[PDB]
Motif scaffolding. Structure first.
Motif, PDB file in Angstrom:
ATOM      1  N   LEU A 288       0.804  -1.209   0.000  1.00  0.00           N
ATOM      2  CA  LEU A 288       0.000   0.000   0.000  1.00  0.00           C
ATOM      3  C   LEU A 288       0.840   1.264   0.000  1.00  0.00           C
ATOM      4  CD1 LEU A 288      -3.073  -0.784   2.184  1.00  0.00           C
ATOM      5  CD2 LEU A 288      -2.904  -0.250  -0.238  1.00  0.00           C
TER       6      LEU A 288
ATOM      7  N   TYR B 192      -3.427  -6.821   0.757  1.00  0.00           N
ATOM      8  CA  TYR B 192      -3.275  -7.365  -0.585  1.00  0.00           C
ATOM      9  C   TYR B 192      -4.467  -7.012  -1.458  1.00  0.00           C
ATOM     10  CZ  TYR B 192      -2.450 -10.668  -4.359  1.00  0.00           C
ATOM     11  OH  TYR B 192      -2.211 -11.238  -5.591  1.00  0.00           O
ATOM     12  N   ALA B 193      -5.681  -7.096  -0.910  1.00  0.00           N
ATOM     13  CA  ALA B 193      -6.860  -6.854  -1.734  1.00  0.00           C
ATOM     14  C   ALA B 193      -6.966  -5.390  -2.129  1.00  0.00           C
ATOM     15  CB  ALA B 193      -8.127  -7.303  -1.004  1.00  0.00           C
ATOM     16  N   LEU B 194      -6.498  -4.487  -1.264  1.00  0.00           N
ATOM     17  CA  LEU B 194      -6.607  -3.056  -1.492  1.00  0.00           C
ATOM     18  C   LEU B 194      -5.498  -2.508  -2.371  1.00  0.00           C
ATOM     19  CD1 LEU B 194      -7.547  -2.030   2.167  1.00  0.00           C
ATOM     20  CD2 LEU B 194      -9.082  -1.926   0.175  1.00  0.00           C
ATOM     21  N   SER B 195      -4.477  -3.272  -2.638  1.00  0.00           N
ATOM     22  CA  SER B 195      -3.318  -2.678  -3.280  1.00  0.00           C
ATOM     23  C   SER B 195      -3.341  -2.906  -4.784  1.00  0.00           C
ATOM     24  CB  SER B 195      -2.039  -3.270  -2.684  1.00  0.00           C
ATOM     25  OG  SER B 195      -2.020  -4.666  -2.886  1.00  0.00           O
ATOM     26  N   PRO B 196      -2.530  -2.167  -5.542  1.00  0.00           N
ATOM     27  CA  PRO B 196      -2.290  -2.563  -6.936  1.00  0.00           C
ATOM     28  C   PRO B 196      -1.354  -3.756  -6.956  1.00  0.00           C
ATOM     29  CG  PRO B 196      -1.024  -0.593  -6.412  1.00  0.00           C
ATOM     30  CD  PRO B 196      -1.840  -0.910  -5.188  1.00  0.00           C
TER      31      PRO B 196
END
Ligand SMILES: [Ca+2]
Ligand SMILES: [Ca+2]
Ligand SMILES: [Ca+2]
Ligand SMILES: [Ca+2]
Ligand SMILES: [Cl-]
Ligand SMILES: [Cl-]
Ligand code: NA
Lengths: 350, 347
Positions: free
Chosen positions: A206, A313-317
DNA sequence: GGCAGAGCTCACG
DNA sequence: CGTGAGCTCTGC
């Protein structure tokens, strides 16, 4: 009679020993070589420094007792082993000549195993392999009865030192997925280091784009140090805006309050408290802890380590696996991770 | 030989001792009082905790040897003083009742002066004032020969503890209590709509300066450019879809959500569990393993854990626009009239 | 309710 | 010159 070891001579002696170790072909000349191999290639940091320092001292000055650690030890030939290790080996040798292959400890003689008058089996020791390495390293130093033998064993010791690996994970795997990597990393406690690594590389996902600087600290660095607020401190624009406390053991309300208080005293307004897999059996009133923190000017939140990693992990590129391995490698250097941590994580990528 | 000090009894003893200390009229009733004064008011933190703990153990249990620091010490009445101090004094007493005035150490019996079998003048110590405090604390513990004498000295020691100062400055309260906001929003389920609101505004806080577009949808309708309950866009592409469950559910509801995201090329799905998402049969790891074979990174989280993790990662500046986030969410999920009312009853 | 050590920064006298 | 205080981390 106490002894003063000449630090300029010991420096020259260990330089010659290193050049000999770099050309050494027959390391089986002395019959302590298996013991020397097992101590030097072992995962116990302090016995490596104690072994090298004792042999160096006896190779330099035949008056010393290589089993003495402190100048006022009640034996003939006692000497200040701590000052020889820190001034010569740490201060001048390990960096330029050995590439930090002893562990790159800044003050190894403040580690518990070195804080004794004598290197002795009477010194309390953790059971298991640490007790075995204690006896091996005693036996080697006890065998170093002349300058010549001590020098011979020093060369063999540095020869094995030069074989040691660094804090770098080489992914042999073609490709791994992040969640499976995290799951295998945190399954073993590894002295608290694996949960700190999982938390750190998740922040990197992030922080990559927002210009965060993530500072994970050596896990045995104390909260009294000026070099940290909590386990992991996150900078944006040169200011810590978030600190993380990781617990991979059970904790109580006073543990939480202790971390909150450190953040409060440094003016850090956001704290995440992460519970690793061993932070179990915890009837603890999180809302009361969070309320207490709020009055102290700290916004406090809780999460399991695994949930935190999967949410980051889900929020990141999504970035290349090569970039994840970099996060791991940089964190391992920053926290000066232990050998057993490096070996455990390297085994995951095999 | 080792004895066990009952920690629950020790707690009752030191609470009594503190109450006696707080009303103590005469602190000179024991001839150790000057030594106790000099140790407790001294600058050596570990001797303070050693003194208190050893007097506590002997006052609690007459079998104890107050000079023992470790259970394996080769004396009669050895005991684990580290565990007495950490679980009773540190864990439960110093903070709530002594205002941190011993020093507020979290692990005092890892401090070097405590890492011996016996408290004795054989142990390493600095020359000068520390040497003297070492001898004084040994002498006090040596004189604690009965429960009654140990208690009396303990009360005197706590009396002097109360006279120390613990100069920590009380900051102001946090300006923005996000945890409170979220707790208030989701305390009423409002047909699963307050959980959707909580999740959506946390995403707004985190994505406001990352270029995200958050598209929340009516939470109990599967209507066709929408994927799950909340779709997160970066660069006009959904990269993450969130289902917000605040009622019971099974793995058919999970596989249904995973399939819809897969069919749309979304590879990341979060399943949020609200406070009312109870009685769960799900083997979560099995659902996750199945979603992976469909090319979907699936994970689970409490609504509260997720919202406060997003806030912890957020910039402080996003807090001005939180009411805009709530109002836009209410419209996007076509909230029920009773839901708009409950939300406005908070802001 | 078991017990206690390997590491680390920061010092003192 | 010599070496301790206080503090991190669960390991066995
Ligand atoms: Ca012993
Ligand atoms: Ca820490
Ligand atoms: Ca920690
Ligand atoms: Ca304020
Ligand atoms: Cl190494
Ligand atoms: Cl000192
Ligand atoms: Na839904």
């Amino acid at each position: 009679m106490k002894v003063l070891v000449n630090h300029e001579q010991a420096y020259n002696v260990i330089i010659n020993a290193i050049n000999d170790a770099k050309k050494l072909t027959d390391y089986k000349t002395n019959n302590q070589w298996v013991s020397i191999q097992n101590v030097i290639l072992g995962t116990h940091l302090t016995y490596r420094y104690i072994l090298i320092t004792g042999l160096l001292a006896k190779a330099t000055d035949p008056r010393v007792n290589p089993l003495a650690l402190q100048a006022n030890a009640p034996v003939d030939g006692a000497y200040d082993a701590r000052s020889l290790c820190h001034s010569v080996i740490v201060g001048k040798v390990e960096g330029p000549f050995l590439e930090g292959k002893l562990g790159a400890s800044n003050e190894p003689f403040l580690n518990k195993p070195a804080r004794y008058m004598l290197h002795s089996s009477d010194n309390p020791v953790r059971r298991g392999n640490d007790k075995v390495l204690q006896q091996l390293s005693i036996d080697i130093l006890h065998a170093a009865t002349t300058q010549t033998l001590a020098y011979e064993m020093l060369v063999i010791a540095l020869y094995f030192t030069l074989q040691r690996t660094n804090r770098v994970i080489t992914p042999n795997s073609i490709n791994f997925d992040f969640h499976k990597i995290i799951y295998n990393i945190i399954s073993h406690p590894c002295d608290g280091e694996t949960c700190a690594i999982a938390a750190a590389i998740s922040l990197h996902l992030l922080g990559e784009q927002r210009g965060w600087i993530i500072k994970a600290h050596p896990v045995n660095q104390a909260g009294s140090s000026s070099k940290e607020i909590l386990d992991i401190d996150v900078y944006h624009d040169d200011i810590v805006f978030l600190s993380i406390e990781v617990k991979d053991k059970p904790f109580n309300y006073q543990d939480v309050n202790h971390a909150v208080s450190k953040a409060s005293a440094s003016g850090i307004s956001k704290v995440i408290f992460l519970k690793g897999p061993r932070a179990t059996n915890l009837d603890i009133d999180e809302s009361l802890a969070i309320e207490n923190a709020a009055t102290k000017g700290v916004s406090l939140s809780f999460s399991d380590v695994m949930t935190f990693t999967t949410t980051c992990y889900a929020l990141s590129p999504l970035l290349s696996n090569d970039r994840i391995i970099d996060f791991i490698n940089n964190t391992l250097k920053d926290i000066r991770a232990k050998d057993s941590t490096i070996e455990y994580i390297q085994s995951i990528f095999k």
